[PDB]
A paper describes a structure:
The computationally designed i301 nanocage is a promising NP synthetic model with increased particle uniformity and thermostability. It is derived from the 2-keto-3-deoxy-phosphogluconate (KDPG) aldolase enzyme of the Entner–Doudoroff pathway of a hyperthermophilic bacterium called Thermotoga maritima. i301 is composed of 60 monomeric subunits that assemble together into a dodecahedron structure with 12 pentagonal faces. Mutating the C76A and C100A regions of i301 to alter disulphide bond formation resulted in an optimised mi3 NP with increased particle uniformity and thermostability. Here, we present HIV-1 Env trimers in a high-density arrangement on the surface of a self-assembling mi3 NP platform using the SpyCatcher/SpyTag system.
Author numbering:
A (entry chain s), B (entry chain H), C (entry chain C), D (entry chain Q): 115 to 318
The structure:
């Protein structure tokens, strides 16, 4: 179900903020701009409170998840607060097992073929590629040969100029951080609209 | 308390829409653009449902009221759904009495000196001026002589070009309909920001 | 039935004259020019005699009514003389009740939202807007928001240059006085034809 | 008697001031400039004292009345202080009845055909038109058709440029406020002379 949501929506807002209020305002702004997949990172103060207080957006068709999850304790708080997916920057076997037992989609971060194969052995075929700005679209193209069934969601350095190159490399979706979420709520809503239009114009 | 909110915020979004979903999206858009006073008109389908489902914005500092109220039945539904103020296009003695008994702020609409004096005799000193595009800022200036203590909130034809003329005439606030609320959610948020900046630039 | 006649014919001749003979000649002239709705105003001397003596035009498809009715006494004389509709410059509760008891269409005049709501509470949804030259087409557009089911027939200052602006504002019909009825019988018949052609050219 | 004074003098000074002393100085200035009808508005501090202290000007042929009367209490104080006429911005049934019982001329303010007909039913045929700057000379021309016997005294926005247009529309007299009464006593006397000369030059 989560794979079909990533495939349909093609973009995840990777939300970093300095407060609960700033995070909520930015989550609303990206949703009003047409971004339905919203990742509340655990670098946001009280990220569990932010996820819980955004739960009303699910009735409007938002999908609220947790990102930068680095412990089972954080994964637990995220799920208890109503996170619909979990994202980490790394591969975490304890978070993988916890997410499997809870029936919650987990997207581990990988950077190498060895980490990719470890993630596959834990049952993961949809992988965060992080940092995307270091490995680039070339890594995604290289992995298509030996790993044809693995799908990537790159995070890091995705912007309006390179987003169509990522889709041409064969990514499932993109995780967009500062290029989307940096600025005032109005500028964030305008950037969200521009990303949705740019992605549509190179994936239809 | 409601007078000080009108004086502080200086703008009310007069929200007309064809559905509950459109009304909610536009209410969020004006709030994200910095408009805190939001009038859900009873020409919106299920306007009571819209008011109830927007109640979470009150925790963010939105003030949600009802507009185009033309019966005590509509006034009751609005208050039960959590409306914080009532607005009508006309003077209504039954709505005035009901609002007084409920302890809810009522802003009747007036167009004439006779209707103004009737509204004052019912205890109203803050009056909707409607239609504002017919009577203009000249009516507000004319009423300052005989009625120095009456304050107006004009509705109808208020736009970015004339809003500062309304404040120069001595209005308390402005009710803005189609010039703010018409368009996509993104265009409505941008127009809300432009109205807030324009009003600030001629009232500070 | 009267609503469908106003909707079909789109124009009422508002007939003012200084004698019975002048009124009859002008009523014939507007009818020969294609205007079927003819309002004999009670500012015409012996207006009841004029209505009675024009009764033969009903067999030709003219609809003869009374205008400038300001008392139940005048309303009675108009109906007894065979008036098919009553028009007043104001809202009159006694004329409203009398017209309801007689089963005769009454079109009250209104200028304000408060008078409009009073007229609606008396069962009137088709309202004379008077004076039309003071409130303009902007008033009709403003009333469409809060009062979508109310239909206007403006009277006062309607002419060949502005008649299409009134229809674009969403009026049901127009009441035309001096711009149609002033002049010789020949000039009145030519003006009637010009109004019918102008209205057709912007309402089809 | 008051109708013939309005018809003869054609102008009423509508006197607003911030003190008894300023009001008296301005009343003297307009009288020395040839304006005999002087309306002391109840927005003047101690307006009853001003009327009483101007009573000596009646021996010189000044006609001193009260304006902006909005209660029977104010009407009583005005009459007890020697007001020769009462003016209000609105139609007031209690002031109408009180003025009738006292045998004092009352000129109610009206803005609509409905208020006009209410004023006529209370015995008033000479009406203040207020605010004159909103309804304009076009309203006076429109009322001549349905209400040939009603006479208007417009107040609000009357000045040296438009005063002759008001007389061409068929007003009985004009009420002149800020265009006459604003300035030093010398400037007010010069403006009074200029208004009297301008009115004479378009009404003789």
């Amino acid at each position: 179900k989560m794979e079909e949501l990533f495939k349909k929506h093609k973009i995840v807002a990777v939300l970093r903020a300095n407060s609960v209020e700033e995070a909520k305002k930015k989550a609303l702004a990206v949703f009003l701009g047409g971004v339905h997949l919203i990742e509340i990172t655990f670098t946001v103060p009280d990220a569990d409170t932010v996820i819980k207080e955004l739960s009303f957006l699910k009735e409007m068709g938002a999908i609220i998840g947790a990102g930068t999850v680095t412990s089972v304790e954080q994964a637990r708080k995220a799920v208890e607060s109503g996170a619909e997916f979990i994202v980490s920057p790394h591969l975490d076997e304890e978070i993988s097992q916890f997410a499997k037992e809870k029936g919650v989609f987990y997207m581990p971060g990988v950077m190498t073929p060895t980490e990719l194969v470890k993630a596959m052995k834990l049952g993961h075929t949809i992988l965060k590629l992080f940092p995307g700005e270091v490995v680039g679209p070339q890594f995604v193209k290289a992995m298509k040969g030996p790993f044809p069934n693995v799908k990537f969601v790159p995070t890091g350095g995705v912007n309006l100029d390179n987003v169509c190159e990522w889709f041409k490399a064969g990514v499932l979706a993109v995780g967009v951080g500062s290029a989307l979420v940096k600025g005032t709520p109005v500028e964030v809503a305008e950037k969200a609209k521009a990303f949705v239009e740019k992605i549509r114009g190179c994936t239809e």
